[PDB]
């Protein structure tokens, strides 16, 4: 499913991401925008045998299990496939753990590159939340 900007913002707010660990809603919508362009189905393959999964491109090395990634930790204790769900529950729950691991939202390279320190509130401007 390809979420709409305001649709995702609303869904992310409903999931407790608005200001989760000091990160405003805009950061999460912006992160989703550059990580997966709002597509819950998105997947990215790397060069270290790991795959990125879903709306927030969660990696198969530390967070989810896909059974083919070396040095896997599965810290979110869930199969990566569950992260390709149409609803964003699984991805959000895992992201909450990630953002709490010690690097904040920096764990998402796309966020760091294109969102961090920008007017992220713009990602929810014309949204009825």
């Amino acid at each position: 499913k390809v979420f709409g900007r305001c649709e995702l913002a609303a869904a992310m707010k409903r999931h407790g991401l608005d200001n989760y660990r000091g990160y405003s809603l805009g950061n999460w919508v912006c992160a989703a925008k550059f990580e997966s362009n709002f597509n819950t189905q998105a997947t990215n393959r790397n060069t270290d045998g790991s795959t990125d999964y879903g709306i927030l491109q969660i990696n198969s090395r530390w967070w989810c299990n896909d059974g083919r990634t070396p040095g896997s930790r599965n810290l979110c204790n869930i199969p990566c496939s569950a992260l390709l769900s149409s609803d964003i529950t699984a991805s959000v729950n895992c992201a909450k753990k990630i953002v709490s691991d010690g690097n904040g939202m920096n764990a998402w390279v796309a966020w760091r590159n294109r969102c961090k320190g920008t007017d992220v509130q713009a990602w929810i401007r014309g949204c009825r939340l």
Partner: antibody, heavy 116, light 108 residues
Framework: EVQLQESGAELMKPGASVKISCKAT????????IEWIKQRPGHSLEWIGE????????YYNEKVKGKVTFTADASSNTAYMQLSSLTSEDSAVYYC?????????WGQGTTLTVSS | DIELTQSPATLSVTPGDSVSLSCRAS??????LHWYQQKSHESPRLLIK???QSMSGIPSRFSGSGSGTDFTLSINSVETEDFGVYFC?????????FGGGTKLDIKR
């Protein structure tokens, strides 16, 4: 205990299409990727693509993308690979394998013969 | 794609002798390289995983080494049952790619 059982040898004429099946058991079917490999004599093993059963997620290697289509039926632990607009270059043995980085569990392979 | 070049293409060895097979990658794949043995009309059998991890149940005579772009498969004390083709395959990137294979025949 993990096992992958593929469909039998196939013969089709060019222009036609075929659907090979890979039924996998002994493990959680929706967690592992199923990867497809093509092997021809005088040719190196070629990775065709992959599908994550039940998630609707796929990935193709264009050498065979506009002509390859993966699908899966979670209710029977079966993954399918469809090849369209067949030509003699498609003649080969096709394998499905569970994605473990390395390939430890292989289907027995299905031989496709494309001829008039 | 990462290209795996296997050298040599064939090998003739007397039982009891020890030999080596080479697989070189066009670009670094760390230790994400695996080795297989394939008999005629059979599915490839995994022998060595992640460069040096011997698959369980596999004869001790099989060893793997290397790192980055140069890998080696060692078959020590070759036995008659060892005839067949051996391949290396990298899982570092997608598409996964395979080496062109090394056919091992028994010298008698």
């Amino acid at each position: 205990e993990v096992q992958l059982q593929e469909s039998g040898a196939e013969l089709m004429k060019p222009g036609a299409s075929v659907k090979i099946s890979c039924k996998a058991t002994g493990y959680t079917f929706t967690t592992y990727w199923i990867e497809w490999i093509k092997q021809r004599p005088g040719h190196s093993l070629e990775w065709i693509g992959e599908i994550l059963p039940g998630s609707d997620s796929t990935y193709y290697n264009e050498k065979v993308k506009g002509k390859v289509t993966f699908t899966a039926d979670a209710s029977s632990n079966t993954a399918y690979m469809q090849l369209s607009s067949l030509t003699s270059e498609d003649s080969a043995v096709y394998y499905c394998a569970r994605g473990d980085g390395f390939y430890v569990y292989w289907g027995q392979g299905t031989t496709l013969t494309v001829s008039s | 794609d990462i290209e795996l070049t296997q050298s040599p293409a064939t090998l003739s060895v007397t039982p009891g002798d020890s030999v080596s097979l080479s697989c070189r990658a066009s670009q670094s794949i760390s230790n994400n390289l695996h080795w297989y043995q394939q008999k005629s009309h059979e599915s490839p059998r995994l022998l060595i995983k992640y460069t040096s991890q011997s698959m369980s149940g596999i004869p001790s005579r099989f060893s793997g080494s290397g790192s980055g772009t140069d890998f080696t498969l060692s078959i020590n004390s070759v036995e008659t049952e060892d005839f067949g083709v051996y391949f290396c395959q990298q899982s570092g990137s997608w598409p996964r790619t395979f080496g062109g294979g090394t056919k091992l025949d028994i010298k008698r």
